[PDB]
Amino acid sequence: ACYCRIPACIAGERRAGTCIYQGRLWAACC
Amino acid sequence: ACYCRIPACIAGERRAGTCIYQGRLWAACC
Amino acid sequence: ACYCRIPACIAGERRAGTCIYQGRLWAACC
Amino acid sequence: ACYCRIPACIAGERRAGTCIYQGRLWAACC
């Protein structure tokens, strides 16, 4: 499904939203 | 890394936080 | 001072992001 | 009725959740 990443989603993935954990924001990548 | 799921993380996974996309919350599972 | 609201921010307010609580997303309004 | 803050909610307020904007997390204080 969607995988959390920083700083950005990678080739093939579309950024759908945001994840929050360990005190920070991440890209939610689908 | 961390994978977003509903309604909960599954066996082997630790819930680290939350994902936000398509208008809803998901479990962030690591 | 950002204030959490649904379904949207009101006149005079700028939507800056999102809040999460009580199981749902809200507009963060600044 | 919920207001976003860092680093914590203050006296009289209870932390209900989290806000996301300008690249960081905030406490959602109700």
Numbering used by the authors:
A (entry chain E), B (entry chain D), C (entry chain A), D (entry chain B): 1 to 30
Text of the article:
Analysis of intermolecular contacts within the Y16A/F28A-HNP1 crystal indicates that mutant monomers assemble into compact dimers reassembling canonical dimers of wild-type HNP1. The replacement of the bulky side chains of Tyr16 and Phe28 by linear Ala side chains allows the dimer to pack more tightly and form an additional set of H-bonds on the opposite face of the dimer. The new set of four H-bonds pins the short β1 strand of one monomer to the equivalent strand of the other monomer to form a two-stranded antiparallel β-sheet. The fact that the I20A/L25A double mutations were irrelevant, but the Y16A/F28A double mutations were quite relevant, for E. coli activity is insightful, because it demonstrates that the hydrophobicity of Tyr16 and Phe28 has repercussions beyond dimerization.
They are small (2–5 kDa), stabilized structurally by three disulfide bonds, form oligomers, and are divided into α, β and θ structural classes. Further analysis of probable quaternary structures by the Protein Interfaces, Surfaces and Assemblies (PISA) software indicates that the HNP1 dimer forms a tetramer or dimer of dimers in a crystal.
